[PDB]
């Protein structure tokens, strides 16, 4: 859950 | 029994993502497109049965299937996600397919659009005559 995200990150 | 064979094929996975001028009624802020293709002047359809793009569960009909080129999905959304991609082969033996977990990332508004390319090399050791024929046409 809460998998959808903005930005690349990592 | 004297001869052995290793066949290598090049796949390209990638995506583009751009912020919309105006968001959709649902609040989708981005337009994106994800794809699987071969290099220039290739014909991967010779050995590709279909490509399945596993979209996030929030999308309607999330298991998107492309049986013919181009193998791509064009969508609108509000966020990126891990997008599993299955490439199925026109093959009677194993392997039947290959899976990639594709990072469909979206940039923030005020940042440049996404244009990503991910190269993937497949290797088939001693394929069947029929599959070898298919692979080498691509």
In this structure, how many other beta carbons lie within 10 angstroms of the beta carbon of residue B47?
Answer: 25
What is the resolution in angstroms?
A: 2.0
Q: Which residue has the tokens 């029929």?
A: B130
Chain B residue numbers touching A9 (CB-CB < 8 A): 105
Query: Which method was it determined by?
Result: X-ray
Measured in whole angstroms, how far is the alpha carbon of residue B31 from the centre of its chain?
Answer: 17
Separation of alpha carbons B138 and B9, rounded Å: 8
Nearest to B118 by CA among B106, B103, B98: B103
Given a contact cutoff of 8 angstroms between Cβ atoms, the answer to whether B72 and B33 are in contact is yes
In this structure, how many other beta carbons lie within 10 angstroms of the beta carbon of residue A9?
Answer: 7
Contact B81 A3 (CB under 8 A): yes
Nearest to B71 by CA among B19, B10, B131, B14: B14
Of the candidates A4, A6, A7, which has its C-beta nearest B56's C-beta?
Answer: A4
| Interface-testing mutation among A1, A3, A10, with chain B (most B C-beta atoms within 10 A) | A3
Contact B106 A7 (CB under 8 A): yes
Residues B85, B103, B120, B90, Cα dihedral to 10°: 0
Separation of alpha carbons B128 and B134, rounded Å: 10
Q: Which residue has the tokens 């923030």?
A: B108
Given a contact cutoff of 8 angstroms between Cβ atoms, the answer to whether B42 and B83 are in contact is no
């Amino acid at each position: 859950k809460g998998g959808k995200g903005l930005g690349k990150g990592g | 029994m004297a001869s052995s064979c290793a066949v290598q094929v090049k796949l390209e996975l990638g995506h583009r993502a751009q912020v919309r001028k105006k968001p959709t009624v649902e609040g989708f802020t981005h337009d994106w497109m994800v794809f699987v293709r071969g290099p220039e002047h290739s014909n991967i359809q010779h050995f590709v049965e279909k490509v399945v793009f596993h979209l996030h569960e929030s999308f309607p009909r999330p298991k998107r299937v492309c049986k013919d080129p181009p193998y791509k999905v064009e969508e609108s959304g509000y966020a990126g996600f891990i997008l599993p991609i299955e490439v199925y082969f026109k093959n009677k033996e194993e392997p039947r397919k290959v899976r990639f977990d594709y990072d469909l990332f979206l940039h923030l508004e005020g940042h440049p659009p996404v244009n990503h390319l991910r190269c993937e090399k497949l290797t088939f050791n001693n394929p069947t005559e029929d599959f070898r024929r298919k692979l080498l046409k691509a």
